[PDB]
Amino acid sequence: RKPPKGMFLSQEDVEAVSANATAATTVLRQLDMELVSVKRQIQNIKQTNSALKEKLDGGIEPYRLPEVIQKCNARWTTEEQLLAVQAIRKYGRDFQAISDVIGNKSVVQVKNFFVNYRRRFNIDEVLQEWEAE
Amino acid sequence: PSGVEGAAFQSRLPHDRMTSQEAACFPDIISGPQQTQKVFLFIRNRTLQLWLDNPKIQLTFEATLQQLEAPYNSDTVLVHRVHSYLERHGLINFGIYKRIKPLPTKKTGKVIIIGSGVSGLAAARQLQSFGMDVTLLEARDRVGGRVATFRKGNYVADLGAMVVTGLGGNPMAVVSKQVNMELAKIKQKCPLYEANGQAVPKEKDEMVEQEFNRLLEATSYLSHQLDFNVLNNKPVSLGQALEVVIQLQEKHVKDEQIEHWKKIVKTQEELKELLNKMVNLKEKIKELHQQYKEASEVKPPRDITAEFLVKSKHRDLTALCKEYDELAETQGKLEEKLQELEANPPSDVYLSSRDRQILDWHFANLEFANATPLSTLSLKHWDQDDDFEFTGSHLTVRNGYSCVPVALAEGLDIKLNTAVRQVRYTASGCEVIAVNTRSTSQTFIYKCDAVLCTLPLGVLKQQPPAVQFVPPLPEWKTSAVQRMGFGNLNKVVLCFDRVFWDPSVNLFGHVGSTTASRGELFLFWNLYKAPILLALVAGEAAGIMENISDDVIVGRCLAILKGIFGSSAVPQPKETVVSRWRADPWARGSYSYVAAGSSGNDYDLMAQPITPGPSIPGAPQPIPRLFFAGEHTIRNYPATVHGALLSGLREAGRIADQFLGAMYTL
Amino acid sequence: PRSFAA
Numbered sequence A: 001r002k003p004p005k006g007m008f009l010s011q012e013d014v015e016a017v018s019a020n021a022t023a024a025t026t027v028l029r030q031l032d033m034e035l036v037s038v039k040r041q042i043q044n045i046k047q048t049n050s051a052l053k054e055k056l057d058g059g060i061e062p063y064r065l066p067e068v069i070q071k072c073n074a075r076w077t078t079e080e081q082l083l084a085v086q087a088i089r090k091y092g093r094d095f096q097a098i099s100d101v102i103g104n105k106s107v108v109q110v111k112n113f114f115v116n117y118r119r120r121f122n123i124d125e126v127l128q129e130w131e132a133e
Numbered sequence B: 001p002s003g004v005e006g007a008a009f010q011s012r013l014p015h016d017r018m019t020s021q022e023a024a025c026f027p028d029i030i031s032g033p034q035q036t037q038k039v040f041l042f043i044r045n046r047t048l049q050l051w052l053d054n055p056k057i058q059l060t061f062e063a064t065l066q067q068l069e070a071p072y073n074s075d076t077v078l079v080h081r082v083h084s085y086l087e088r089h090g091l092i093n094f095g096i097y098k099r100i101k102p103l104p105t106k107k108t109g110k111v112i113i114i115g116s117g118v119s120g121l122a123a124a125r126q127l128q129s130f131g132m133d134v135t136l137l138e139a140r141d142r143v144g145g146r147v148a149t150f151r152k153g154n155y156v157a158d159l160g161a162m163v164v165t166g167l168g169g170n171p172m173a174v175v176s177k178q179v180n181m182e183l184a185k186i187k188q189k190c191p192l193y194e195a196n197g198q199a200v201p202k203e204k205d206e207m208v209e210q211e212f213n214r215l216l217e218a219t220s221y222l223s224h225q226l227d228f229n230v231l232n233n234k235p236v237s238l239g240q241a242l243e244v245v246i247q248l249q250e251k252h253v254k255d256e257q258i259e260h261w262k263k264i265v266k267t268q269e270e271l272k273e274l275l276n277k278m279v280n281l282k283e284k285i286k287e288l289h290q291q292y293k294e295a296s297e298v299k300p301p302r303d304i305t306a307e308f309l310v311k312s313k314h315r316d317l318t319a320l321c322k323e324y325d326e327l328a329e330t331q332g333k334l335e336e337k338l339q340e341l342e343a344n345p346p347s348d349v350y351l352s353s354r355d356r357q358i359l360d361w362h363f364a365n366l367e368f369a370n371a372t373p374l375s376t377l378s379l380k381h382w383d384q385d386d387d388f389e390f391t392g393s394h395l396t397v398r399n400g401y402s403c404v405p406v407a408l409a410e411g412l413d414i415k416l417n418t419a420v421r422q423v424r425y426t427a428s429g430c431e432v433i434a435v436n437t438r439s440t441s442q443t444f445i446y447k448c449d450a451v452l453c454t455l456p457l458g459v460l461k462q463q464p465p466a467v468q469f470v471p472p473l474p475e476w477k478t479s480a481v482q483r484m485g486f487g488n489l490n491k492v493v494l495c496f497d498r499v500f501w502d503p504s505v506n507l508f509g510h511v512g513s514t515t516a517s518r519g520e521l522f523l524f525w526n527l528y529k530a531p532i533l534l535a536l537v538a539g540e541a542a543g544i545m546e547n548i549s550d551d552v553i554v555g556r557c558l559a560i561l562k563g564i565f566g567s568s569a570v571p572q573p574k575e576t577v578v579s580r581w582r583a584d585p586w587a588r589g590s591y592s593y594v595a596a597g598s599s600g601n602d603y604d605l606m607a608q609p610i611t612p613g614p615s616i617p618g619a620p621q622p623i624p625r626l627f628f629a630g631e632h633t634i635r636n637y638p639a640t641v642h643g644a645l646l647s648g649l650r651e652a653g654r655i656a657d658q659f660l661g662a663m664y665t666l
Numbered sequence C: 001p002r003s004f005a006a
């Protein structure tokens, strides 16, 4: 029913190795050259990646900014409202970004802000100019 | 098996079924009610048992009927029909046994038998037992043919047949009870020793052997399942198939390597794109940090846009620092995935130069068994006789195999030194023209009713013919002769004064240097009482080693043994013999094999008798006159002693039926 | 025959 387990013998493979007198050696050479081709392609991309790794030396350590932990406040200071208007102008509907810019406002408070100060901070106009970019 | 059913087995017969041969002789019974068949089968089996339990005395119909029970002993004509059948076809009362009824006063019919090999001898004994005039014509100065046995002093070594291949169902089991054969079992352990002369480690030994066994099954698969049996009109040989199978196993080894390194490039190329993304991000982080810095250097008090800038750039920087850390996470996973794949590669090679050499020894062993280059063997059929192999340990005849033909030769008209030159067969009878092998001009003429030809296949193959048939053998017969293969294997007998080998090791191999010379002195036997080592020459080597002197051959024999046991532990051999079976004119080879393009059916053709044309045109269809026995005639047991023996029995039965008539078929 | 094989 099936070849001994570990032996590999398909109808297609038999016909290929016995197509002519040296069809056996031809197939085994085309794979020997394919092996060399792929093996030297490995060392090439190994060299390419070795160079790209050296450029990432140091990481991003001299570029990290320390953790700023501040408790979430309910009151909107005039300052905070103005930061918000500009954060809408720069981020649109990204409520998470706006929340981080202001610092002490939860994502929901930001969502509320949109509805609350809607007409007074012309948020309709602010959002349509953000889309223009 | 034991009892009555074990007797049928020991006689190569199904205990609970009627054979085709029995159907012919008893067409009344086999076509009748099942009840009668079982009575028949029991009678048969019981009679066989009786003969087998005591094979040193003739078993008469009287002695048989005496020891039968009711309701089996009620029908005495059935018992007589059975007993006669078994006697005629040599299942009972064959070989060497005391006769209760001394041979009939006058003989009936005359048979000339060519050759006094075992097949000849067997038939002769039977025909004499049937009351026929029998004369054997042997070209050699001895009986036995391919059963040859070297003797000198205490040294005894077979140059021909050597091994009794199991007693389970072997007619030689019966013979060994009648003849003093000193049968000793063979321990199948065979340590190998490479070219340098050092043992193959059990690691390699077992793993190469397993690969061999696996390569064989693979060819069988190629034959039956993939139907790979014809290539460019020519029939595929076992050698061709093994080569094809090995190539595809080297192909797989390469295919595996290709797709494994193909996995590496795809992962290494994922890493390449990720590092590019990381370099392009550490670039934007570098710039963005500078911008945030410059925004923070603007000390307050500052208006809200300037405050927003600082905050904005702060958010943007930690957002990009979030991405880079999630990419350094991915980089850590792909970088260890590449240490995974590079750690365990697939197989480097299929078989090394050291491996392939040990594999060649296994091929040489197969080339020895079939006495032929694997490129000559039929892929489909080379092992067609496997199904009928005997059970039990293989044994050697410790006192030499010749003891058997010699024992069979006792009380027989055997003309030694008599080379048959021509066989003439006509509707009225036969004449055989032979010469004296010494003075070849002295001519003999033999007139007979029938000729039994036991000429080896190599002899029958000679061109120009050594024996001329008049009229010439029919095309169907000669084509069978050409198609069939007649192999070759040789033996080197080395006699020493002292045992310098492992006394409990019966056989040890030697691994050759090249594929070309794999058969050359590849195996050594320690089987006999005296210090004798026997070296085999198989495959393509056998044919070439015949054109080389005994001194050179024994030279290479000592060389190999020195490398294995110590260059000063191997003394000079006292007596040496080297066989040359292909050169021998009375053999022209060693024994038959199923050649590519042949089948087991050719063996049947070889056994078919020849019936001459009528003398007077319009005269009735004549009796068959020319019969054939021998190793090459027995489909189910070719290339063996027992097979030869059996074919002789077969013919003696067929000939007696023809010229003395069958009384048991009523 | 295969029977002879070591």
Ligand SMILES: Cc1cc2nc3c(=O)[nH]c(=O)nc-3n(C[C@H](O)[C@H](O)[C@H](O)COP(=O)(O)OP(=O)(O)OC[C@H]3O[C@@H](n4cnc5c(N)ncnc54)[C@H](O)[C@@H]3O)c2cc1C
Pocket (backbone or CB within 6 Å): B114, B115, B116, B117, B118, B119, B120, B137, B138, B139, B140, B143, B144, B145, B146, B147, B159, B160, B161, B162, B163, B164, B165, B418, B419, B420, B421, B454, B455, B456, B459, B466, B467, B489, B490, B491, B581, B585, B586, B587, B589, B590, B591, B629, B630, B631, B632, B638, B639, B640, B641, B642, B644
């Ligand atoms: C090296 C070797 C090892 C073997 N080992 C084994 C083994 O271990 N086990 C096993 O079972 N079998 C073995 N065999 C095979 C076995 O020996 C033979 O199959 C068997 O003996 C053949 O018997 P035969 O009567 O058919 O042929 P043969 O014994 O060859 O009988 C033919 C006879 O005819 C004679 N003859 C030839 N030409 C003429 C002529 N022109 N006129 C008159 N006479 C002629 C010959 O001299 C010979 O005596 C071995 C064979 C060889 C070569």
